[PDB]
Amino acid sequence: NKLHLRVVTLIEHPFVFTREVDDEGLCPAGQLCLDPMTNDSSMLDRLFSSLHSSNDTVPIKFKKCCYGYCIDLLEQLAEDMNFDFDLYIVGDGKYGAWKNGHWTGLVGDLLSGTANMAVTSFSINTARSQVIDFTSPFFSTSLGILVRTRGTELSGIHDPKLHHPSQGFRFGTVRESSAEDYVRQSFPEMHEYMRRYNVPATPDGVQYLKNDPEKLDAFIMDKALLDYEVSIDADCKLLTVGKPFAIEGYGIGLPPNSPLTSNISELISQYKSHGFMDVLHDKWYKVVPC
Question: Which CATH number fits the domain that encloses residue 167?
Answer: 3.40.190.10
Entry resolution (Å): 1.7
Residues 89 and 126 both lie in one domain: yes
d(CA 9, CA 79): 18
178 annotated binding-site participant: yes
d(CA 96, CA 103): 6
121 annotated binding-site participant: yes
128 annotated binding-site participant: yes
Residues 211 and 286 both lie in one domain: no
Q: Report yes or no: 4 and 84 within 8 Å, Cβ to Cβ.
A: yes
Q: Report yes or no: 12 and 202 within 8 Å, Cβ to Cβ.
A: yes
150 annotated binding-site participant: no
Experimental technique used to determine this entry: X-ray
Cα 178 to Cα 95, 124, 246, distances in angstroms:
9, 9, 9
142 annotated binding-site participant: no
Residues 114 and 258 both lie in one domain: yes
| Count of other CB atoms within 10 angstroms of residue 260 | 19
The residues that bridge with 118 in the sheet, in sequence order, are 8, 253
179 annotated binding-site participant: yes
Strand arrangement of the beta sheet that strand 83-89 belongs to: 17-19, 63-67, 31-34, 83-89, 3-9, 117-118, 253-254, 133-134
* 63: three-class secondary structure by DSSP: strand
Cα 75 to Cα 55, 84, 87, 238, distances in angstroms:
27, 9, 11, 32
Residues 145 and 207 both lie in one domain: yes
The residues that bridge with 85 in the sheet, in sequence order, are 5
Residues 246 and 257 both lie in one domain: no
219: left (phi over 0), alpha (psi -120 to 50) or beta: beta
- 261 Cβ contact list (under 8 Å, min separation 6): 133, 134, 135, 254
The string of DSSP letters for 206-217 reads: HHHHHSSS-S-S
Give the distance, in angstroms, between the CA of residue 77 and the centroid of all CA atoms in the same chain: 18
Task: List the domain range (segments joined by +) for residue 201.
Answer: 141-251
The continuous run of DSSP H or E covering 118 comes out as strand 117-118
Residues 25 and 95 both lie in one domain: yes
Nearest-10 crossing angle of helices 69-81, 276-284: 150
Residues 256 and 135 both lie in one domain: yes
Residues 10 and 98 both lie in one domain: yes
Residues 194 and 150 both lie in one domain: yes
Residues 246 and 261 both lie in one domain: no
| Total number of domains constituting the chain | 2
Residues 122 and 259 both lie in one domain: yes
